[PDB]
Write a protein that binds this ligand. Sequence first.
Ligand SMILES: *[C@@H]1O[C@H](CO)[C@@H](O[C@@H]2O[C@H](CO)[C@@H](O)[C@H](O[C@@H]3O[C@H](CO)[C@@H](O)[C@H](O)[C@H]3NC(C)=O)[C@H]2NC(C)=O)[C@H](O)[C@H]1NC(C)=O
Ligand SMILES: *[C@@H]1O[C@H](CO)[C@@H](O[C@@H]2O[C@H](CO)[C@@H](O[C@@H]3O[C@H](CO)[C@@H](O)[C@H](O)[C@@H]3O)[C@H](O)[C@H]2NC(C)=O)[C@H](O)[C@H]1NC(C)=O
Ligand SMILES: *[C@@H]1O[C@H](CO)[C@@H](O[C@@H]2O[C@H](CO)[C@@H](O[C@@H]3O[C@H](CO)[C@@H](O)[C@H](O)[C@@H]3O)[C@H](O)[C@H]2NC(C)=O)[C@H](O)[C@H]1NC(C)=O
Ligand SMILES: *[C@@H]1O[C@H](CO)[C@@H](O[C@@H]2O[C@H](CO)[C@@H](O)[C@H](O)[C@H]2NC(C)=O)[C@H](O)[C@H]1NC(C)=O
Ligand SMILES: *[C@@H]1O[C@H](CO)[C@@H](O[C@@H]2O[C@H](CO)[C@@H](O)[C@H](O)[C@H]2NC(C)=O)[C@H](O)[C@H]1NC(C)=O
Ligand SMILES: *[C@@H]1O[C@H](CO)[C@@H](O)[C@H](O)[C@H]1NC(C)=O
Ligand SMILES: *[C@@H]1O[C@H](CO)[C@@H](O)[C@H](O)[C@H]1NC(C)=O
Ligand SMILES: *[C@@H]1O[C@H](CO)[C@@H](O)[C@H](O)[C@H]1NC(C)=O
Ligand SMILES: [Ca+2]
Lengths: 973, 48
Amino acid sequence: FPSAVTIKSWVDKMQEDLVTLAKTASGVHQLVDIYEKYQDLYTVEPNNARQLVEIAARDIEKLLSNRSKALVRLALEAEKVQAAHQWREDFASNEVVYYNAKDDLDPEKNDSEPGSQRIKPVFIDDANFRRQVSYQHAAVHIPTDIYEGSTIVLNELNWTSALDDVFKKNREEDPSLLWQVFGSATGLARYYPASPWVDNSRTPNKIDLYDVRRRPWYIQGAASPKDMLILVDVSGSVSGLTLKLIRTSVSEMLETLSDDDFVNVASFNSNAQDVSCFQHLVQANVRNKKVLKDAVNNITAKGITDYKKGFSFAFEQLLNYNVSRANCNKIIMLFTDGGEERAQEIFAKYNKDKKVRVFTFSVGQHNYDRGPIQWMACENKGYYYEIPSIGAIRINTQEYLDVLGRPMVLAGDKAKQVQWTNVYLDALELGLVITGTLPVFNITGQFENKTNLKNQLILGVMGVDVSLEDIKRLTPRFTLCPNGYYFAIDPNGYVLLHPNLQPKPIGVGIPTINLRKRRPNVQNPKSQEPVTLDFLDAELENDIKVEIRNKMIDGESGEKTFRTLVKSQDERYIDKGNRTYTWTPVNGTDYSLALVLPTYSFYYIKAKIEETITQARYSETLKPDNFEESGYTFLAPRDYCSDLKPSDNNTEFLLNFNEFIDRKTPNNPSCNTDLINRVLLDAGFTNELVQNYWSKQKNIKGVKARFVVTDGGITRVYPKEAGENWQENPETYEDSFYKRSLDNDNYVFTAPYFNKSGPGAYESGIMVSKAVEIYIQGKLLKPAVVGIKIDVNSWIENFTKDCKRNSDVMDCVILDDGGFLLMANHDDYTNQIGRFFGEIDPSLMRHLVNISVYAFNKSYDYQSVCEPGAASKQSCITEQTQYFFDNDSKSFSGVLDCGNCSRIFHVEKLMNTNLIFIMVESKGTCPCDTRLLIQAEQTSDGPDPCDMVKQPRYRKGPDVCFDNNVLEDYTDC
Amino acid sequence: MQLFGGRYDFEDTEVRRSNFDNFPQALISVFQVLTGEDWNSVMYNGIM
Ligand SMILES: *[C@@H]1O[C@H](CO)[C@@H](O[C@@H]2O[C@H](CO)[C@@H](O)[C@H](O[C@@H]3O[C@H](CO)[C@@H](O)[C@H](O)[C@H]3NC(C)=O)[C@H]2NC(C)=O)[C@H](O)[C@H]1NC(C)=O
Ligand SMILES: *[C@@H]1O[C@H](CO)[C@@H](O[C@@H]2O[C@H](CO)[C@@H](O[C@@H]3O[C@H](CO)[C@@H](O)[C@H](O)[C@@H]3O)[C@H](O)[C@H]2NC(C)=O)[C@H](O)[C@H]1NC(C)=O
Ligand SMILES: *[C@@H]1O[C@H](CO)[C@@H](O[C@@H]2O[C@H](CO)[C@@H](O[C@@H]3O[C@H](CO)[C@@H](O)[C@H](O)[C@@H]3O)[C@H](O)[C@H]2NC(C)=O)[C@H](O)[C@H]1NC(C)=O
Ligand SMILES: *[C@@H]1O[C@H](CO)[C@@H](O[C@@H]2O[C@H](CO)[C@@H](O)[C@H](O)[C@H]2NC(C)=O)[C@H](O)[C@H]1NC(C)=O
Ligand SMILES: *[C@@H]1O[C@H](CO)[C@@H](O[C@@H]2O[C@H](CO)[C@@H](O)[C@H](O)[C@H]2NC(C)=O)[C@H](O)[C@H]1NC(C)=O
Ligand SMILES: *[C@@H]1O[C@H](CO)[C@@H](O)[C@H](O)[C@H]1NC(C)=O
Ligand SMILES: *[C@@H]1O[C@H](CO)[C@@H](O)[C@H](O)[C@H]1NC(C)=O
Ligand SMILES: *[C@@H]1O[C@H](CO)[C@@H](O)[C@H](O)[C@H]1NC(C)=O
Ligand SMILES: [Ca+2]
């Protein structure tokens, strides 16, 4: 085994060889030279990240105040309009004309139900809606089990028809506005503009079971947040059909709950235990509810019924005050069949003043006495609900919000506050969106205070979407580098706006569906959960980020600079990036907005080119017939002008881009000058490289392909044969290697993938990249990232000439940080190239981490898909490992032993690059396995919830809670 | 009533109306078996 100085001297002649090959062939110092040679085609402006945040915080203020004004007027009209409605019952005499969504639009149908008359609308196709729509009226959604033509429903479509004039007045004023909808108390919803619903009832074989009342946006503006507590009666009498019904009501009751709502679930049979692991009221987020809905299911009925120990346990649960709580409506609901005891004594003290509200549910078909339960409900200002059937569950476990809304409708105007929802997928397929809601109240005869019998309910709730693609147009990231971004946050820790946030729903648990019990044609529910990713789950968690995260939940302003490690774009690397954060509150709302920058991004380039010939000359550089002397040029699909659209077929896009500058001068009076201009300047900078430097050295021996991925989207792979293999995203702010090249001050090597499809190994090769780094007036800039795809065959020859091909004495390999295998001596390893090195000899890799040579961090990706397990895709959690050098020390000697053998490995790290060289004795001499240490998205179901909630994350609830008005009717059950 | 009352607690959704839960109903069930009418369906419920 060679000495430590021989490995030292032999690494230094093959890290000097790779870097000279990459410093020379790519042209780092040449592209630095021509950014500095000009100085005057551009100027260098600063990103004032105090100022940028303040500017952004105000476009989201004004956007969400403009939405709010529209909401207020609609509400006023609805209140005024229905106070002048006459309650007619002759509807076959005077037809109600409306367009009904989810109905066949074929003219020849002509069903013509009594009372109603439909509309055939004309349906232009649209952008900002990715569906055909009509701007002349509002559609109407009736849920499926609700009959339309009922006097109760027919009378909504009469009075609600005056909203189409106010609907129209909102979009005339603001073209950008998205869905406008009124969700009725009656269960009928009207939205503008009209479009056909996505599931028709019976024209396909999937049938929608969508109810407006059920909806989260409808619920948050229906009522105030609430600490509920479900009691379940588990006595012996319940076992049977009735027990079956209860498990489906509680799961149903929960659907109703929200993050702001706290909830626990207890159960009694002569003792009250608590159904799961929790013991206090927990946040009823997606996870906690998933635990409770998984413990409600396993319940077995046995034993004597005791309503006294069931309501003692409930009240005690209600009084914890140590835990984090909603502290608003306090209510307890019991599911039971029949009661012989009213438990008068427990209610006298625990709730002598009736602070708590009791709702009693009688379920199943049975003969047990319901008088005592009704009495309990009446005594406590709750309500009573029967459920005999499965189809009766859905409208009675949502109906309690008519009771809880009462002291809000007695609060008057004070209760008309806009609230904005958690991001969620739109019913109509719009994408991620948030809705601002306002409740409409039933005011009839207010002038004189004549009735009030049913004047304590809301007419319904009114909402208006903001799409998250509308907010991302108020937070522009182009001046800032790929590293910089804006993050938005609730007072709940959830992230409103984040690079990491994705359309797929956030998943819980490992998905298990039973194929042996799913019928071939019945169509179960798909999903309704909100997409609540948290800030400490969108990014790698620190302790110096939980400080930042708490500090901008409680509405403060500030900046912070620290060293933290960024997870890479692809999930394979972790790079220590020195960042600065800066946050401020959006003053109209409860959102607070932040901005990450990396020091060195504090300055950007603005293009200062305006000459006729110079913008002209740089623009034919990106012509696809002129790639024989330029290099297969790419271009990023920014929204350059409003007219040319991002196309995802890039040769399509670059023609429509470059047609646009010929057919019209780049002045373009409805199109931003700087973004297009910077691109033009850039293409004259990645031209002078490809003309005056790369086309001189037309073939370097080991060099396969040469790229300049730059800022302005223009990536230039140098031979067109090589550009067929360029499998990157052509958007330069989505490339992984672009972003890892900017963090590092040394050449970076990217490992090719293992297996997969497409040619990514011998054909393209392993790639090196390096950020260009210029200084203008003593101000650091990193404009571009040069690079090289390496030839893996040639590199091997230099490497071979104490390691020989087909060696049995000892094997040596080169590994980039992250532990991936790039170059291998054996030839059974270099076939499996770009593979995680702990999968080809897991014994050595395990030891290396122990020596402190390597470090890692497992994280959770709450938005990913996986195949089900037997117990096409669902959402699930994956755990993800990344590996990264944590020790700066250059060399590491030692020996590892498996038991009865030693192997002496020597590790040396090449200077000036992330690569590491290790020499070790052949694996075959000691037959050892430990277990195969693998690095992949690995399906898992963590972290366990029962341990998170003992020390929950900081949170801030709603300031205004409406409950317990003294003059509430409290007489109807 | 001693053999079959309280024992027809099936987690189906079908109705088994000739059962032994009350004394009036139990009484109704015995007279049904004495006519012979659908007496095997009553016996199938008691075996399950
Ligand atoms: C493997 O090792 C070889 C030899 O060191 C290395 O070589 C290429 O080697 C030749 C041998 O002299 C170099 O001349 C050649 O470099 C160029 O010519 C002169 C030499 O001083 C200088 O201008 C630069 O070194 C460089 N510039 C040129 C010619 O444009 C050198 N480079 C190539 C690729 O031909 C291989 O690169 C090593 N294997 C790799 C690529 O890792
Ligand atoms: C709910 O539906 C009823 C029935 O369609 C609507 O009442 C109708 O309202 C219109 C305009 O308010 C009435 O038109 C007026 O008719 C009189 C003659 O009757 C004429 O002198 C006026 O110049 C005008 O043309 C219509 O007659 C009336 N129908 C009845 C039976 O009274 C009502 O408008 C709908 N509510 C909403 C909010 O849309
Ligand atoms: C808003 O509140 C008002 C009352 O404050 C509600 O109006 C009431 O609606 C009921 C519906 O059951 C009407 O009662 C019906 O009367 C007819 C006679 O026309 C009778 O045939 C029915 O059997 C039933 O008793 C009642 O007339 C009406 N009250 C008033 C004062 O107009 C209204 O329904 C609420 N708004 C919404 C959208 O529900
Ligand atoms: C958000 O609103 C606050 C006030 O509630 C603004 O703070 C003010 O800032 C101005 C100068 O910008 C000072 O003159 C005032 O004294 C500040 N307010 C108070 C009460 O001291 C803040 O600038 C606003 N920020 C944004 C982004 O809109
Ligand atoms: C992420 O990895 C880093 C390794 O660099 C961890 O940081 C070290 O954590 C240990 C305890 O696990 C401390 O003793 C060291 O002082 C830390 N070193 C540095 C440089 O921070 C970090 O804990 C990991 N994060 C997680 C969540 O495991
Ligand atoms: C807000 O409304 C005003 C007035 O219609 C308009 O000028 C402005 O552009 C709107 N802002 C946003 C972000 O929609
Ligand atoms: C982080 O900050 C220190 C001190 O300002 C600086 O020396 C270092 O270069 C920064 N980190 C990186 C990766 O540049
Ligand atoms: C290093 O390995 C030793 C022996 O296997 C072990 O006791 C120790 O915990 C390891 N160090 C770390 C950091 O895990
Ligand atoms: Ca008979």
